[PDB]
Amino acid sequence: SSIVSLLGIKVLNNPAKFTDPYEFEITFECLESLKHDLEWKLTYVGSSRSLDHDQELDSILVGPVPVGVNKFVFSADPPSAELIPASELVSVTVILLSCSYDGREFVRVGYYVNNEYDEEELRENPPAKVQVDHIVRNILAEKPRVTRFNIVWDNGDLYPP
Amino acid sequence: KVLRDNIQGITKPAIRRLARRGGVKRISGLIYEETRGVLKVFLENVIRDAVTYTEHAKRKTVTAMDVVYALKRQPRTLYGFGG
Amino acid sequence: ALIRKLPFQRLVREIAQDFKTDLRFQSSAVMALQEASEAYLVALFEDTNLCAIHAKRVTIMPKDIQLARRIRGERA
């Protein structure tokens, strides 16, 4: 059972420009001293057809972990458009916030993110040349999908990984 | 490619019922083969575990309690924080 | 309830036949798998639908299922 549990995430700047940074306030609880590091990662899903287009946006490595309620704000740089398959750039995708203990992932938070041109005429008639500066993004901040994984913290599975 | 590869465990009307159950209103025709591939990965994961448990217990057949335990090893996805 | 038992049961046997030859399932074991599979697909379709709605579409596409799997944090 989890020594570290995530208590909340706030998406601070939303909706936003495609090229705006992602601002999050993350709140978590650490119940007892841990020997190793926590690592929070933010991944942007570049293509739904494969993991090969994932872009890691940021990574916050914390060690040692302070015991008790921890609250922190960070700002992550946006994905770069050039790396995203053209036909998927201006459509819905997913971003993932995960956390790991000693490199073992124990929680993952997903949000849907829609991308849309900011003006009528472009929406109805998108250009062959993607105009990144007119893309607005909208994170479905009210609907986090949170998935936990059991891991070993600092320690009797009869069928271990 | 060959017949064994194309054996399926869920019909098209069944996929349409499940999608309606999930609040879906309209689907592309490509949803059928996508849903089937997803069901297959799920089943492979659970059955691999269930069978492992069965073999270590030397049982003749896979029992409900091997499957029930295998299902507990699947991650659960919740709708907010704390649960 | 939502899906027929015999096609499903045959698929389970075909997958089992990769991990272990002529290992059979008890009918209550198959039933538990069948119920879990339905609940799994229903939940997947809910996220798939949510994806479509957030994209401002009414028709779910393969990409909506692919993304719903990412956002459910399935470890590919």
Residue numbers in the entry:
A (entry chain A): 1 to 155, 159 to 164
B (entry chain C): 20 to 102
C (entry chain B): 60 to 135
What wording appears in the published article?
The protein anti-silencing function 1 (Asf1) chaperones histones H3/H4 for assembly into nucleosomes every cell cycle as well as during DNA transcription and repair. The histone chaperone, anti-silencing function 1 (Asf1), is highly conserved throughout eukaryotes and binds to a heterodimer of H3/H4. In the Asf1-H3/H4 complex, the C terminus of H4 forms an antiparallel β sheet with the globular core of Asf1.
To restrict the conformational flexibility of the H4 C-terminal tail, we replaced G94 with either a proline, which is predicted to favor the more extended structure of the H4 C-terminus seen when H4 binds to Asf1, or an alanine, which is slightly more conformationally constrained than glycine and expected to have a smaller effect on C-terminal tail flexibility. Comparisons of the Asf1-H3/H4 and Asf1-H3/H4G94P structures revealed both local and global effects conferred by the proline substitution. The RMSD between the Asf1-H3/H4 to the Asf1-H3/H4 G94P structures for all of the protein backbone atoms is 1.06 Å. Overall, histone H4 has an RMSD of 0.46 Å, but the RMSD of the C-terminal tail alone (H4 92 to 101) is 1.35 Å, whereas the core of the protein excluding the tail has an RMSD of 0.29 Å. Close inspection of the site of the G94P substitution shows an unraveling of the last turn of the third α helix of H4 and a reorientation of Arg92. Thus, the overall structure of the Asf1-H3/H4G94P complex differs from the WT complex, and this is largely due to the changes in the H4 C-terminus from the inability of the proline to adopt the same conformation as Gly94 of H4.
